[PDB]
Design a protein around this motif. Structure first.
Motif, PDB file in Angstrom:
ATOM      1  N   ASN A 188      31.965   4.006  -5.463  1.00 55.28           N
ATOM      2  CA  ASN A 188      32.102   3.814  -4.207  1.00 55.28           C
ATOM      3  C   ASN A 188      33.430   3.192  -3.390  1.00 55.28           C
ATOM      4  O   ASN A 188      33.586   3.015  -2.318  1.00 55.28           O
ATOM      5  CB  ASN A 188      31.113   2.747  -3.526  1.00 55.28           C
ATOM      6  N   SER A 189      34.602   3.678  -4.266  1.00 53.99           N
ATOM      7  CA  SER A 189      35.835   3.230  -3.952  1.00 53.99           C
ATOM      8  C   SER A 189      36.366   4.323  -2.857  1.00 53.99           C
ATOM      9  O   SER A 189      36.056   5.546  -2.977  1.00 53.99           O
ATOM     10  CB  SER A 189      36.928   3.080  -5.157  1.00 53.99           C
ATOM     11  N   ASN A 190      37.591   3.809  -2.104  1.00 56.33           N
ATOM     12  CA  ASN A 190      38.181   4.699  -1.098  1.00 56.33           C
ATOM     13  C   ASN A 190      39.197   5.914  -1.809  1.00 56.33           C
ATOM     14  O   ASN A 190      39.457   6.586  -0.988  1.00 56.33           O
ATOM     15  CB  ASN A 190      38.895   3.890   0.050  1.00 56.33           C
ATOM     16  N   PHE A 191      39.805   5.339  -3.018  1.00 53.23           N
ATOM     17  CA  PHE A 191      40.516   6.156  -3.705  1.00 53.23           C
ATOM     18  C   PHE A 191      39.813   7.340  -4.183  1.00 53.23           C
ATOM     19  O   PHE A 191      38.701   7.397  -4.600  1.00 53.23           O
ATOM     20  CB  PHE A 191      41.209   5.558  -4.974  1.00 53.23           C
ATOM     21  N   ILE A 192      40.592   8.626  -3.917  1.00 48.70           N
ATOM     22  CA  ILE A 192      40.320   9.969  -4.467  1.00 48.70           C
ATOM     23  C   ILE A 192      39.150  10.215  -3.494  1.00 48.70           C
ATOM     24  O   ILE A 192      38.178   9.700  -3.300  1.00 48.70           O
ATOM     25  CB  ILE A 192      39.884  10.297  -5.812  1.00 48.70           C
ATOM     26  N   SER A 193      39.344  11.597  -2.473  1.00 48.32           N
ATOM     27  CA  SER A 193      38.383  11.897  -1.588  1.00 48.32           C
ATOM     28  C   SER A 193      37.197  12.601  -2.219  1.00 48.32           C
ATOM     29  O   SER A 193      37.229  13.183  -3.286  1.00 48.32           O
ATOM     30  CB  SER A 193      39.354  13.172  -0.784  1.00 48.32           C
ATOM     31  N   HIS A 194      36.127  12.458  -1.598  1.00 42.44           N
ATOM     32  CA  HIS A 194      34.795  13.026  -1.968  1.00 42.44           C
ATOM     33  C   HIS A 194      34.606  14.428  -2.184  1.00 42.44           C
ATOM     34  O   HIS A 194      34.137  14.839  -3.309  1.00 42.44           O
ATOM     35  CB  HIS A 194      33.721  12.611  -0.857  1.00 42.44           C
ATOM     36  N   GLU A 195      35.733  15.150  -1.620  1.00 48.46           N
ATOM     37  CA  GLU A 195      35.928  16.628  -1.644  1.00 48.46           C
ATOM     38  C   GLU A 195      36.662  16.811  -3.079  1.00 48.46           C
ATOM     39  O   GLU A 195      36.065  17.956  -3.925  1.00 48.46           O
ATOM     40  CB  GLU A 195      36.820  17.482  -0.705  1.00 48.46           C
ATOM     41  N   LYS A 196      37.804  16.122  -3.423  1.00 45.27           N
ATOM     42  CA  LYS A 196      38.562  16.153  -4.633  1.00 45.27           C
ATOM     43  C   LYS A 196      37.813  15.763  -5.847  1.00 45.27           C
ATOM     44  O   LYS A 196      37.972  16.354  -7.008  1.00 45.27           O
ATOM     45  CB  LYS A 196      39.933  15.765  -4.464  1.00 45.27           C
ATOM     46  N   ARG A 197      37.200  14.640  -5.612  1.00 43.71           N
ATOM     47  CA  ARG A 197      36.258  14.030  -6.729  1.00 43.71           C
ATOM     48  C   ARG A 197      35.212  14.952  -7.393  1.00 43.71           C
ATOM     49  O   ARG A 197      34.816  15.141  -8.486  1.00 43.71           O
ATOM     50  CB  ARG A 197      35.868  12.820  -6.300  1.00 43.71           C
ATOM     51  N   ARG A 198      34.545  15.824  -6.516  1.00 42.57           N
ATOM     52  CA  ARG A 198      33.517  16.584  -6.729  1.00 42.57           C
ATOM     53  C   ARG A 198      34.091  17.898  -7.558  1.00 42.57           C
ATOM     54  O   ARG A 198      33.561  18.490  -8.533  1.00 42.57           O
ATOM     55  CB  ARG A 198      32.759  17.154  -5.494  1.00 42.57           C
ATOM     56  N   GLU A 199      35.248  18.226  -7.141  1.00 44.05           N
ATOM     57  CA  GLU A 199      36.163  19.371  -7.752  1.00 44.05           C
ATOM     58  C   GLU A 199      36.618  18.923  -9.235  1.00 44.05           C
ATOM     59  O   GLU A 199      36.722  19.847  -9.859  1.00 44.05           O
ATOM     60  CB  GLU A 199      37.250  19.829  -6.737  1.00 44.05           C
ATOM     61  N   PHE A 200      37.128  17.641  -9.470  1.00 40.53           N
ATOM     62  CA  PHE A 200      37.210  17.127 -10.628  1.00 40.53           C
ATOM     63  C   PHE A 200      36.097  17.253 -11.694  1.00 40.53           C
ATOM     64  O   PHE A 200      36.269  17.482 -12.793  1.00 40.53           O
ATOM     65  CB  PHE A 200      37.675  15.808 -10.704  1.00 40.53           C
ATOM     66  N   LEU A 201      34.899  17.005 -11.155  1.00 39.63           N
ATOM     67  CA  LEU A 201      33.627  16.933 -12.060  1.00 39.63           C
ATOM     68  C   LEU A 201      33.075  18.399 -12.253  1.00 39.63           C
ATOM     69  O   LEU A 201      32.567  18.520 -13.187  1.00 39.63           O
ATOM     70  CB  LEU A 201      32.507  16.371 -11.189  1.00 39.63           C
ATOM     71  N   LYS A 202      33.438  19.351 -11.128  1.00 36.23           N
ATOM     72  CA  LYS A 202      33.349  20.715 -11.456  1.00 36.23           C
ATOM     73  C   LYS A 202      34.300  21.313 -12.615  1.00 36.23           C
ATOM     74  O   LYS A 202      33.995  22.163 -13.342  1.00 36.23           O
ATOM     75  CB  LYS A 202      33.574  21.605 -10.146  1.00 36.23           C
ATOM     76  N   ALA A 203      35.623  20.989 -12.457  1.00 41.13           N
ATOM     77  CA  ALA A 203      36.671  20.996 -13.322  1.00 41.13           C
ATOM     78  C   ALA A 203      36.419  20.662 -14.792  1.00 41.13           C
ATOM     79  O   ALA A 203      37.000  21.604 -15.640  1.00 41.13           O
ATOM     80  CB  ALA A 203      38.147  20.546 -13.166  1.00 41.13           C
ATOM     81  N   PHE A 204      35.871  19.546 -15.059  1.00 40.06           N
ATOM     82  CA  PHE A 204      35.211  18.987 -16.437  1.00 40.06           C
ATOM     83  C   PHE A 204      34.084  19.943 -16.856  1.00 40.06           C
ATOM     84  O   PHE A 204      33.468  19.625 -17.861  1.00 40.06           O
ATOM     85  CB  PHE A 204      35.127  17.542 -16.459  1.00 40.06           C
ATOM     86  N   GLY A 205      33.441  20.584 -15.894  1.00 36.79           N
ATOM     87  CA  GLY A 205      32.062  21.343 -16.046  1.00 36.79           C
ATOM     88  C   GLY A 205      31.070  20.389 -16.271  1.00 36.79           C
ATOM     89  O   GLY A 205      30.020  20.704 -16.970  1.00 36.79           O
ATOM     90  N   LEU A 206      31.010  19.100 -15.537  1.00 36.81           N
ATOM     91  CA  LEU A 206      29.840  18.233 -15.700  1.00 36.81           C
ATOM     92  C   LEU A 206      28.806  18.770 -14.533  1.00 36.81           C
ATOM     93  O   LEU A 206      27.643  18.809 -14.826  1.00 36.81           O
ATOM     94  CB  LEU A 206      30.421  16.882 -15.235  1.00 36.81           C
ATOM     95  N   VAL A 207      29.068  19.250 -13.255  1.00 38.28           N
ATOM     96  CA  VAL A 207      28.300  19.889 -12.599  1.00 38.28           C
ATOM     97  C   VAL A 207      28.793  21.220 -11.777  1.00 38.28           C
ATOM     98  O   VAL A 207      29.747  21.661 -12.098  1.00 38.28           O
ATOM     99  CB  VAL A 207      28.364  18.890 -10.927  1.00 38.28           C
ATOM    100  N   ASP A 208      27.712  21.929 -11.275  1.00 36.34           N
ATOM    101  CA  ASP A 208      28.148  23.295 -10.779  1.00 36.34           C
ATOM    102  C   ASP A 208      28.472  23.278  -9.233  1.00 36.34           C
ATOM    103  O   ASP A 208      28.749  22.300  -8.738  1.00 36.34           O
ATOM    104  CB  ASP A 208      26.641  24.280 -10.991  1.00 36.34           C
ATOM    105  N   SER A 209      28.876  24.601  -8.647  1.00 38.09           N
ATOM    106  CA  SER A 209      29.057  24.517  -7.295  1.00 38.09           C
ATOM    107  C   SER A 209      28.201  23.728  -6.225  1.00 38.09           C
ATOM    108  O   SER A 209      28.951  23.222  -5.580  1.00 38.09           O
ATOM    109  CB  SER A 209      29.197  25.960  -6.866  1.00 38.09           C
ATOM    110  N   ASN A 210      26.943  23.850  -6.305  1.00 47.60           N
ATOM    111  CA  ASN A 210      26.116  23.059  -5.578  1.00 47.60           C
ATOM    112  C   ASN A 210      26.439  21.442  -5.876  1.00 47.60           C
ATOM    113  O   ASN A 210      26.701  20.653  -5.068  1.00 47.60           O
ATOM    114  CB  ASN A 210      24.700  23.511  -5.875  1.00 47.60           C
ATOM    115  N   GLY A 211      26.143  20.961  -7.341  1.00 46.58           N
ATOM    116  CA  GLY A 211      26.196  19.445  -7.599  1.00 46.58           C
ATOM    117  C   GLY A 211      25.207  19.316  -8.611  1.00 46.58           C
ATOM    118  O   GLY A 211      25.093  18.153  -9.015  1.00 46.58           O
TER     119      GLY A 211
END
Lengths: 244, 244, 244, 244, 242
Positions: free
Chosen positions: C204-227
RNA sequence: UUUUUUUUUUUUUUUUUUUUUUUUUUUUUUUUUUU
């Protein structure tokens, strides 16, 4: 440069069986020598060493090994006499170097008079004579101190020697539990392991001849002319096995 | 300004599999390290380092790793020799920094002569030669110290290497139980977990070539020309599996 | 004079809802602000801050947070590199002031590359990749560090977000037990209470935007395009509930 | 000479019922003098004492009583304001001497503005307003701090006075468990042995007259002109007895 | 050195000389005469007025003088601080040559027991608390210093009744001042206070004649030595309660 | 071993913390002296 070469070349050097055995003799664990204690007593006392040792026996048996601690809670005459002994004989507490003197060491080195003093100082001990009489029928007063182990003649017959050791181990069990609080909750076997090592070391020690040791046990009325112990000693031996 | 941008751009940088692996190698845990021990021995000793190391191996094998503790209960000649070594080689106790020297490190780096010294100092060890002979038929004397793990050649065939390690583990089981009192009540598996980590680390160490290490095991008469261990070694491996 | 009057008159003063709320904002708990860490890294490093941070990530992940302790048991090249970083970036250990730098803080601020480094330094972690693979079928390597909590996007759907947090909690459970010895005997719930507070604070920290943080999880292959998380995450989520 | 005679003659002296009662009054346990706190606040503050005391209410209600600890994890503006107060008012932590000032004492001696401020700082407390609302239907925000016990009018009728004590104890049970971790597992009676005992003294104290104490409760909206509890105070008294 | 030891051990042990040494090297740890000897050495003429203050101080607050000093009135803190500096007052169980609030009250046990009647509700265990355990508990027994007023020359059952009655307070007192003794059984608490209690009863200080007169003056025993019903009730209460 | 002195507006935990282990561990041998 190459620490590989240095290590193998060092190992390549022939091991000298005598040189290594001369080192282990020099680096040996310096045990408790009663001979050094009497040597130190004469070194500081000279002529007064015999009268002062009698005071130190009473002092170790009734109070303890810590001389500056007992000094605080003592009479005006007593505090001065104790303070003098700490300064004269350079008395310490605990287990210091072989060249140092303690109240425990004086009493253990002069075990002969120490066992005789127990008959007088029966109720002034950490474990009183009445306390031991409630565990074993009329417990031997001469056996009521760890220093007694140095009076035990190992040249004694099997069953007779074992009976004495198992009779003395009844006090040791009660003594260790009183002076050491963490040994109160522990079992007989756990307490036994703490005192069996210095006890047997005193029995099998070179100090005091086997002939004179047996004479001492006879003088205290523990064993007869042959070597058979008293009924009370035999009773204490059975009591030690039953009690925990 | 924008610490958001800085963080993502840093992460965007491609991770180099070799650069990161070269760092972990540099930032690796360096406990013992033998090359440094011999480097330090020459740094303080110089010419006397070889004669003094021989004294320190005997000292570590018979007494222990704590040098100021053993110093107290030792002879007048011995106490002076030990005190000199602590001041000269800046000797410490336990597991200190890589740049520090301990009796348990000096013996382990000069493992070649250390294993040879065990044949002489058999009954002066914490676990005597007779004690080990009662567990395994005529236990190898060279295997009676943790420093032996550094003499084990890992390039040895599967079953042959395992037999040596299981035979040496029998002593390590008996050794750990004696020096550490809380390991007496614990099971074989519990004791095994304490010594398996530094033992295997010594076996797979870069110090002493695989060719010379096998020659050392041959010289002690542990393995033959091929690599098959002796009957006494094989009996100890079977004894380790049966005993608890 | 009359302290009775003074106290009531003080209380009689109307409480200002905005003034008191402006004070609580000023007297607010200033925890771990990732923005200050990057600000401090540039303050001491300048241009070398990016290369040195990569070294510090590896250093924190493989050894720990105590820099002067790890310095002792390290190679000649390693000890010098670490000593330099402690002097340059004024690196400390534990939980110091907001203006101070720790190996944990650098690794948690730059959480992007820290999670990427875990794929490389899998077997050099306190809890190895193989250890986690034996608990959950092929555990995600990017989740194997408490800094991953800062990469978790809270804008994720209910069940999807909970699955990620429960999967990451499995490592935290195994991690805390290894680094903290008193947490080994304690239950799952007891260990959970220690890491849930800073974990959720990072999510719940303000650092790293919600858009970029989801992109990071996608890049690591943790979640898909949806979530929707990967099977590896789902199997790790169920494993956390079953294991204790 | 005879210290026997001296002791009996001393005892023979008739005991003076008034002289001994004048001594116990002088040697009485003080602890928290609200009159001394305001006396000290003016001694260090003078004119700024009123504005600075308002700042001290938030600090004790949101962070705690330890001022140098909260100083570390605080904003640049906040850290400077707090540091100034510790130096100006010679602020300490815990329970020091009667002549010393603490953030808990400044918020307890001026309890009136403290209870009024508890409405604004509801979710910044260790136990939030929402947490208390889930246990009791809408708990009165004025009772959400140990300092409210100093407002409880002792002149209020029997069961009307017993009602405030059965309502103020609901928050204190929750509060003590949060701030003190060892009180989490203990029983309700164990918590009562630590919080109800210093609470009775706060209720029955000479500071704030019987008329003004009853007037403050009417200003908040807890009890009317006689002592009947409010709609939210009635349902809260039942919540204390039900909880364990 | 063996012969040296044999020669030493052979020497006849003197029953009187060794008994004169154990008397000199005895634990003691109190004397009571030493406390008054010390009080006069620091006080002189003011020792009697200051001792009265110290009795009240020990009975109501405790034995730790620098701790009670912190949470006390401006007049009180100054009076206490003066006594610690004048009489060199310490806390706990120090050396024989040192003074404590517990020792000042225990040596002058006569006035200490009289003060208990006044300071009944200011004690750690109040008079009302003891009245709920035993019917109207004797106020003079409500302090460990009372053990020094007990006459041991009292008949068997009569002496045992007094000791059993005083032990009831000693059970309630120890549980309050020592928190770890709250959960422990009666026998466990008994073992902590029986040793100094009996030591005070069998002490040489205060004659057996005057000790019995003190118990008579407090109305604990009659002319013969039979205790009052309140004492007898507390003796049965001690056996029933745990 | 006349010891034990508790208590009474006290107590203020968390909030990116917590960093273990690895040629380690070196026990006994007249020690332990308590109330």
């Amino acid at each position: 440069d190459n620490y590989q070469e240095l290590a193998i070349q060092f190992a390549a050097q022939a091991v000298d069986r005598n040189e290594i055995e001369q080192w282990v003799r020099e680096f040996a664990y310096q045990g408790f020598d009663a001979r050094r204690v009497i040597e130190l007593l004469k070194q500081y006392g000279g002529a007064d060493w015999e009268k002062d040792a009698k005071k130190m026996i009473v002092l170790a048996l009734t109070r303890g090994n810590k001389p500056r601690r007992m000094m605080m809670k003592m009479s005006k005459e007593g505090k001065a006499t104790v303070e003098a002994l700490i300064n004269k004989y350079k008395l310490k507490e605990g287990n210091p170097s072989r060249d140092e003197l303690t109240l425990s060491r004086v009493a253990a080195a002069l075990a002969g008079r120490t066992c005789q003093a127990l008959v007088v100082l029966s109720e002034w001990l950490p474990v009183t004579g009445t306390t031991m009489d409630g565990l074993s029928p009329a417990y031997p007063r001469h056996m009521m101190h760890p220093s007694f182990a140095g009076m035990v003649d190992p040249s004694l017959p099997g069953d007779y020697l074992r009976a004495i050791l198992d009779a003395h181990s009844l006090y040791l069990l009660q003594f260790s539990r009183v002076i050491n609080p963490n040994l109160r909750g522990r079992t007989k076997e756990e307490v036994a392991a703490t005192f069996t090592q210095p006890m047997n070391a005193a029995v099998n020690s070179n100090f005091i001849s086997h002939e004179k040791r047996r004479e001492f046990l006879k003088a205290f009325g523990l064993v007869d002319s042959n070597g058979k112990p008293s009924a009370a000693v035999m009773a204490a031996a059975q009591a030690y096995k039953t009690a925990a």
